[PDB]
Amino acid sequence: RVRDFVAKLANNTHQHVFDDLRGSVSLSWVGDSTGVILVLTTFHVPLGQSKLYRSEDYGKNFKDITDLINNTFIRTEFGMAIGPENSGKVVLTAEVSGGSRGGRIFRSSDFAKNFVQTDLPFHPLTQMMYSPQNSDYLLALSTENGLWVSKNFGGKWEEIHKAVCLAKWGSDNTIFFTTYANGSCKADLGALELWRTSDLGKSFKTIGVKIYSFGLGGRFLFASVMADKDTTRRIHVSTDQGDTWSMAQLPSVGQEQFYSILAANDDMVFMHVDEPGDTGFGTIFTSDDRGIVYSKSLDRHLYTTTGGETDFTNVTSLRGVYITSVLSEDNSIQTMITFDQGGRWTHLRKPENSECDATAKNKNECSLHIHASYSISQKLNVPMAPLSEPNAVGIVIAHGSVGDAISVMVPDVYISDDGGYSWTKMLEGPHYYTILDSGGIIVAIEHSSRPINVIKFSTDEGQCWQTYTFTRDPIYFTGLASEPGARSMNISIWGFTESFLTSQWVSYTIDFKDILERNCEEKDYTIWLAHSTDPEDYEDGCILGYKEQFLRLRKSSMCQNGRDYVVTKQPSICLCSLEDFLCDFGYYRPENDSKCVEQPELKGHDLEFCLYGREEHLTTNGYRKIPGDKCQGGVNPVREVKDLKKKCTSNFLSPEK
Amino acid sequence: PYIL
Ligand SMILES: *[C@@H]1O[C@H](CO)[C@@H](O[C@@H]2O[C@H](CO)[C@@H](O[C@@H]3O[C@H](CO)[C@@H](O)[C@H](O)[C@@H]3O)[C@H](O)[C@H]2NC(C)=O)[C@H](O)[C@H]1NC(C)=O
Ligand SMILES: *[C@@H]1O[C@H](CO)[C@@H](O[C@@H]2O[C@H](CO)[C@@H](O)[C@H](O)[C@H]2NC(C)=O)[C@H](O)[C@H]1NC(C)=O
């Protein structure tokens, strides 16, 4: 539908040939709206040399800047540590000789235009980590497990602690780190201490003992803590940097189980707890807004002990939507989706014009299943996992199969433009895919064993496609790079050409600026209610107590949203109902439509929580607003609050007070 | 994801 497209692309396609790119090759973008890309290489000659290339134009042209690093061998293990935001910081870690006291880094503050070499008073063991508040503050662990901090972008270091296993930056330049006191990190597991320093090593506070590990998610600090006189451990949560802790209402686990924070934001967390006896699955729980009371969201959630692969995916392009895989009772794998932050999970709706595959019991009734990390790890023919971007609202693209379970067959690519409610087959056969200019353009490359020289693109969100031949020397295709954030109209195609005699790495960068030659205006956008189920209901669209309508680009408009495009939306607040509340600790919601009632008996970890929980959390009316829930007016449960503590501890003989 |  695009006219003269070949002529509009041909003078905007840019080839670069890399003279040498053997070994591990990596690419990092430096900053937003800079067009800066660094390509680094590392190979050994076994019976070490590194190459560094830099673009400042979104990959159209590179310059060999290997000379800047004195042709030194860069260790790929540490990668390029790119600083936050647009600080323009880059640190590369070098291999030193065997004589050396400490290692060596090459540091740049101007987007890798210039580097200086700095010799370290230690040998780094981890990648260097920037404070998110301050790109000049770095921390790093040494090979001797010292924790070292720098206040001047790695110019000078000081070791603030000697026996450290893990360290991370919190907010406001805070450091949390675990320490061992006995022998090694591994032999002191479960008896580590957790420390905090708010002032870069001047003061410390020990905020936990008998630690196994710790992590940060949203507003929460999580620590797993081992029960003394025991081999099991439990999660404890703090929202004040470990000044105070509460036990979370979650099962304890043995040494062969794990917890994993699937996703976390300012409101809540999704926690996975592995099932006992390494069955390769566990259960998803969602927290309230305190990170303390957890609701079982999804049983038999697939998460493998080998490598730790899970299909859990936030569909970033529609609020509330997540997708994952679960094991059926027959041990086939199905895809499930939730539209309300894990309150309910369902099968994905089959594309109207799809045929049910061989996994389907019924040839007229089946569902869509999605290939993701686990499929890829099992060596299925799946080039990419599912793609969605916050700024291209409603769009999700993924390889999938239509049936009753995930198939081993070669998959096709499906797209949804409503956040996952409905799907269509987008392309036949496996492809690599990218979204450019906030959904203004979708691009795809065929995944082949033979060389390719065509790229497909759509300006109407994957409904109609045009094919451009971007080279007359077909390449073995390796990968697509585009600027993080999906707001660019540049896409780079990477691969290599092979002859009998020789081969060579090549990139082609294509600029769509002449296809999308006009800016979108107000008339190019149309109102769209997200989550619509039934247009006859005044509450159609309500999720977590509010609806949103978006101004979405019309499919038929062919125009650029723009690098400064802002997703325009307008909320409507829904009335509160009982569905906007979670059962608080001690209560549940039996068979039907939504009244939280006292549990008759507390067993298992509920019983543990009652004995170990604070009054604050044990005093309740049985309801708590779903976190992120924005309803106003309507039902407001007025049952009076009671201490459930008295209920359980009532059975126990108490010792003297 | 983040293991504990
Ligand atoms: C796709 O890649 C091209 C580069 O090949 C990007 O072009 C860049 O476009 C930006 C904004 O249009 C230009 O930045 C401006 O620079 C001038 C002076 O240099 C300054 O006064 C402005 O305030 C602004 O910073 C930039 O010149 C240009 N880069 C080059 C090398 O030509 C293009 O933006 C990419 N397309 C998208 C949509 O991301
Ligand atoms: C699922 O992804 C969405 C989209 O990225 C996340 O929502 C963003 O979260 C951050 C941090 O709280 C906010 O600053 C942004 O405003 C949100 N973006 C949008 C478009 O809403 C969301 O938090 C993710 N879910 C979880 C549990 O992390």
PDB file of N, CA, C and O and ligand atoms in Angstrom, chain A residues 262-270 312 314-322 341 389-391 548 567 569, ligand 2:
ATOM      1  N   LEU A 262       9.357 -12.906  40.176  1.00  0.00           N
ATOM      2  CA  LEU A 262       8.991 -12.848  38.748  1.00  0.00           C
ATOM      3  C   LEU A 262       8.875 -11.467  38.224  1.00  0.00           C
ATOM      4  O   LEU A 262       9.270 -11.188  37.074  1.00  0.00           O
ATOM      5  N   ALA A 263       8.237 -10.583  39.025  1.00  0.00           N
ATOM      6  CA  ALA A 263       7.987  -9.203  38.617  1.00  0.00           C
ATOM      7  C   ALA A 263       7.621  -8.400  39.812  1.00  0.00           C
ATOM      8  O   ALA A 263       6.971  -8.889  40.750  1.00  0.00           O
ATOM      9  N   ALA A 264       8.038  -7.149  39.806  1.00  0.00           N
ATOM     10  CA  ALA A 264       7.745  -6.282  40.957  1.00  0.00           C
ATOM     11  C   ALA A 264       7.704  -4.839  40.508  1.00  0.00           C
ATOM     12  O   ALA A 264       8.506  -4.374  39.598  1.00  0.00           O
ATOM     13  N   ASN A 265       6.749  -4.127  41.106  1.00  0.00           N
ATOM     14  CA  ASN A 265       6.622  -2.704  40.873  1.00  0.00           C
ATOM     15  C   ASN A 265       6.345  -1.968  42.159  1.00  0.00           C
ATOM     16  O   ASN A 265       6.661  -2.469  43.249  1.00  0.00           O
ATOM     17  N   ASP A 266       5.779  -0.773  42.049  1.00  0.00           N
ATOM     18  CA  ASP A 266       5.588   0.082  43.222  1.00  0.00           C
ATOM     19  C   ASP A 266       4.409  -0.375  44.012  1.00  0.00           C
ATOM     20  O   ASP A 266       4.176   0.070  45.100  1.00  0.00           O
ATOM     21  N   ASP A 267       3.628  -1.247  43.430  1.00  0.00           N
ATOM     22  CA  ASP A 267       2.394  -1.715  44.072  1.00  0.00           C
ATOM     23  C   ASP A 267       2.515  -3.089  44.753  1.00  0.00           C
ATOM     24  O   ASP A 267       1.979  -3.283  45.820  1.00  0.00           O
ATOM     25  N   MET A 268       3.084  -4.064  44.029  1.00  0.00           N
ATOM     26  CA  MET A 268       3.039  -5.456  44.433  1.00  0.00           C
ATOM     27  C   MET A 268       4.160  -6.234  43.794  1.00  0.00           C
ATOM     28  O   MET A 268       4.961  -5.693  42.984  1.00  0.00           O
ATOM     29  N   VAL A 269       4.241  -7.496  44.172  1.00  0.00           N
ATOM     30  CA  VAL A 269       5.192  -8.449  43.571  1.00  0.00           C
ATOM     31  C   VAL A 269       4.510  -9.744  43.188  1.00  0.00           C
ATOM     32  O   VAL A 269       3.569 -10.158  43.884  1.00  0.00           O
ATOM     33  N   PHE A 270       4.995 -10.395  42.111  1.00  0.00           N
ATOM     34  CA  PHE A 270       4.616 -11.767  41.789  1.00  0.00           C
ATOM     35  C   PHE A 270       5.792 -12.611  42.283  1.00  0.00           C
ATOM     36  O   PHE A 270       6.899 -12.289  41.938  1.00  0.00           O
ATOM     37  N   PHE A 312       7.233 -16.891  32.135  1.00  0.00           N
ATOM     38  CA  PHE A 312       6.569 -15.691  32.669  1.00  0.00           C
ATOM     39  C   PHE A 312       6.942 -14.408  31.946  1.00  0.00           C
ATOM     40  O   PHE A 312       8.106 -14.093  31.898  1.00  0.00           O
ATOM     41  N   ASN A 314       5.625 -10.203  31.363  1.00  0.00           N
ATOM     42  CA  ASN A 314       4.734  -9.044  31.417  1.00  0.00           C
ATOM     43  C   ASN A 314       4.457  -8.594  30.000  1.00  0.00           C
ATOM     44  O   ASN A 314       5.367  -8.342  29.189  1.00  0.00           O
ATOM     45  N   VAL A 315       3.206  -8.520  29.620  1.00  0.00           N
ATOM     46  CA  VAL A 315       2.828  -7.924  28.317  1.00  0.00           C
ATOM     47  C   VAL A 315       2.870  -6.463  28.589  1.00  0.00           C
ATOM     48  O   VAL A 315       1.934  -5.878  29.110  1.00  0.00           O
ATOM     49  N   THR A 316       3.999  -5.801  28.212  1.00  0.00           N
ATOM     50  CA  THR A 316       4.186  -4.441  28.677  1.00  0.00           C
ATOM     51  C   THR A 316       3.270  -3.477  27.977  1.00  0.00           C
ATOM     52  O   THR A 316       3.178  -2.311  28.362  1.00  0.00           O
ATOM     53  N   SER A 317       2.606  -3.933  26.907  1.00  0.00           N
ATOM     54  CA  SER A 317       1.761  -3.021  26.167  1.00  0.00           C
ATOM     55  C   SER A 317       0.307  -2.913  26.571  1.00  0.00           C
ATOM     56  O   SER A 317      -0.452  -2.182  25.901  1.00  0.00           O
ATOM     57  N   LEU A 318      -0.106  -3.561  27.716  1.00  0.00           N
ATOM     58  CA  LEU A 318      -1.416  -3.363  28.217  1.00  0.00           C
ATOM     59  C   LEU A 318      -1.355  -3.647  29.734  1.00  0.00           C
ATOM     60  O   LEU A 318      -0.835  -4.658  30.139  1.00  0.00           O
ATOM     61  N   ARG A 319      -1.799  -2.670  30.519  1.00  0.00           N
ATOM     62  CA  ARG A 319      -1.779  -2.758  31.975  1.00  0.00           C
ATOM     63  C   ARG A 319      -2.446  -4.008  32.453  1.00  0.00           C
ATOM     64  O   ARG A 319      -3.492  -4.333  31.890  1.00  0.00           O
ATOM     65  N   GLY A 320      -1.950  -4.629  33.556  1.00  0.00           N
ATOM     66  CA  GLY A 320      -2.562  -5.820  34.092  1.00  0.00           C
ATOM     67  C   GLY A 320      -2.279  -7.137  33.349  1.00  0.00           C
ATOM     68  O   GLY A 320      -2.579  -8.181  33.862  1.00  0.00           O
ATOM     69  N   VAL A 321      -1.737  -7.090  32.095  1.00  0.00           N
ATOM     70  CA  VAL A 321      -1.722  -8.364  31.331  1.00  0.00           C
ATOM     71  C   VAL A 321      -0.338  -9.058  31.531  1.00  0.00           C
ATOM     72  O   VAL A 321       0.722  -8.422  31.391  1.00  0.00           O
ATOM     73  N   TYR A 322      -0.372 -10.339  31.830  1.00  0.00           N
ATOM     74  CA  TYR A 322       0.845 -11.193  31.915  1.00  0.00           C
ATOM     75  C   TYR A 322       0.508 -12.515  31.231  1.00  0.00           C
ATOM     76  O   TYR A 322      -0.630 -12.951  31.321  1.00  0.00           O
ATOM     77  N   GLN A 341      -3.763  -8.603  36.496  1.00  0.00           N
ATOM     78  CA  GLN A 341      -2.703  -8.703  37.515  1.00  0.00           C
ATOM     79  C   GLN A 341      -2.788  -9.989  38.375  1.00  0.00           C
ATOM     80  O   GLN A 341      -2.424 -10.023  39.578  1.00  0.00           O
ATOM     81  N   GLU A 389       5.823  -3.534  23.710  1.00  0.00           N
ATOM     82  CA  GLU A 389       6.592  -2.318  24.124  1.00  0.00           C
ATOM     83  C   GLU A 389       5.528  -1.402  24.678  1.00  0.00           C
ATOM     84  O   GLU A 389       4.454  -1.354  24.092  1.00  0.00           O
ATOM     85  N   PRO A 390       5.770  -0.761  25.857  1.00  0.00           N
ATOM     86  CA  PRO A 390       4.812   0.107  26.588  1.00  0.00           C
ATOM     87  C   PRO A 390       4.191   1.170  25.650  1.00  0.00           C
ATOM     88  O   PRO A 390       3.012   1.501  25.779  1.00  0.00           O
ATOM     89  N   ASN A 391       5.005   1.708  24.726  1.00  0.00           N
ATOM     90  CA  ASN A 391       4.574   2.786  23.832  1.00  0.00           C
ATOM     91  C   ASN A 391       3.820   2.382  22.574  1.00  0.00           C
ATOM     92  O   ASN A 391       3.114   3.213  21.930  1.00  0.00           O
ATOM     93  N   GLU A 548      -9.309   2.638  30.861  1.00  0.00           N
ATOM     94  CA  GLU A 548      -8.562   3.670  30.184  1.00  0.00           C
ATOM     95  C   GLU A 548      -8.975   3.622  28.729  1.00  0.00           C
ATOM     96  O   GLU A 548      -9.094   2.514  28.162  1.00  0.00           O
ATOM     97  N   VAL A 567       2.159   8.501  24.940  1.00  0.00           N
ATOM     98  CA  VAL A 567       0.887   7.704  24.865  1.00  0.00           C
ATOM     99  C   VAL A 567      -0.196   8.527  25.534  1.00  0.00           C
ATOM    100  O   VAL A 567      -0.121   8.842  26.712  1.00  0.00           O
ATOM    101  N   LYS A 569      -3.850   9.023  26.987  1.00  0.00           N
ATOM    102  CA  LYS A 569      -4.941   8.179  27.525  1.00  0.00           C
ATOM    103  C   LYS A 569      -5.705   8.960  28.584  1.00  0.00           C
ATOM    104  O   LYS A 569      -5.223  10.034  29.079  1.00  0.00           O
TER     105      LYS A 569
HETATM  106  C1  LIG C   2       4.548  -4.671  33.586  1.00  0.00           C
HETATM  107  O1  LIG C   2       5.120  -3.688  32.683  1.00  0.00           O
HETATM  108  C2  LIG C   2       4.489  -2.419  32.726  1.00  0.00           C
HETATM  109  C3  LIG C   2       4.947  -1.658  31.491  1.00  0.00           C
HETATM  110  O2  LIG C   2       6.365  -1.511  31.633  1.00  0.00           O
HETATM  111  C4  LIG C   2       5.030  -1.808  34.047  1.00  0.00           C
HETATM  112  O3  LIG C   2       4.455  -0.537  34.277  1.00  0.00           O
HETATM  113  C5  LIG C   2       5.455   0.499  34.406  1.00  0.00           C
HETATM  114  O4  LIG C   2       6.006   0.413  35.710  1.00  0.00           O
HETATM  115  C6  LIG C   2       6.846   1.516  36.100  1.00  0.00           C
HETATM  116  C7  LIG C   2       7.395   1.301  37.527  1.00  0.00           C
HETATM  117  O5  LIG C   2       6.435   1.168  38.576  1.00  0.00           O
HETATM  118  C8  LIG C   2       6.162   2.887  35.950  1.00  0.00           C
HETATM  119  O6  LIG C   2       7.092   3.935  36.217  1.00  0.00           O
HETATM  120  C9  LIG C   2       5.602   3.068  34.541  1.00  0.00           C
HETATM  121  O7  LIG C   2       4.779   4.212  34.509  1.00  0.00           O
HETATM  122  C10 LIG C   2       4.768   1.838  34.127  1.00  0.00           C
HETATM  123  N1  LIG C   2       4.524   1.957  32.721  1.00  0.00           N
HETATM  124  C11 LIG C   2       3.283   1.936  32.254  1.00  0.00           C
HETATM  125  C12 LIG C   2       3.109   2.105  30.771  1.00  0.00           C
HETATM  126  O8  LIG C   2       2.319   1.790  33.001  1.00  0.00           O
HETATM  127  C13 LIG C   2       4.570  -2.738  35.183  1.00  0.00           C
HETATM  128  O9  LIG C   2       4.920  -2.241  36.448  1.00  0.00           O
HETATM  129  C14 LIG C   2       4.967  -4.249  35.030  1.00  0.00           C
HETATM  130  N2  LIG C   2       4.375  -5.076  36.133  1.00  0.00           N
HETATM  131  C15 LIG C   2       5.164  -5.397  37.144  1.00  0.00           C
HETATM  132  C16 LIG C   2       4.656  -6.277  38.229  1.00  0.00           C
HETATM  133  O10 LIG C   2       6.333  -4.978  37.199  1.00  0.00           O
END
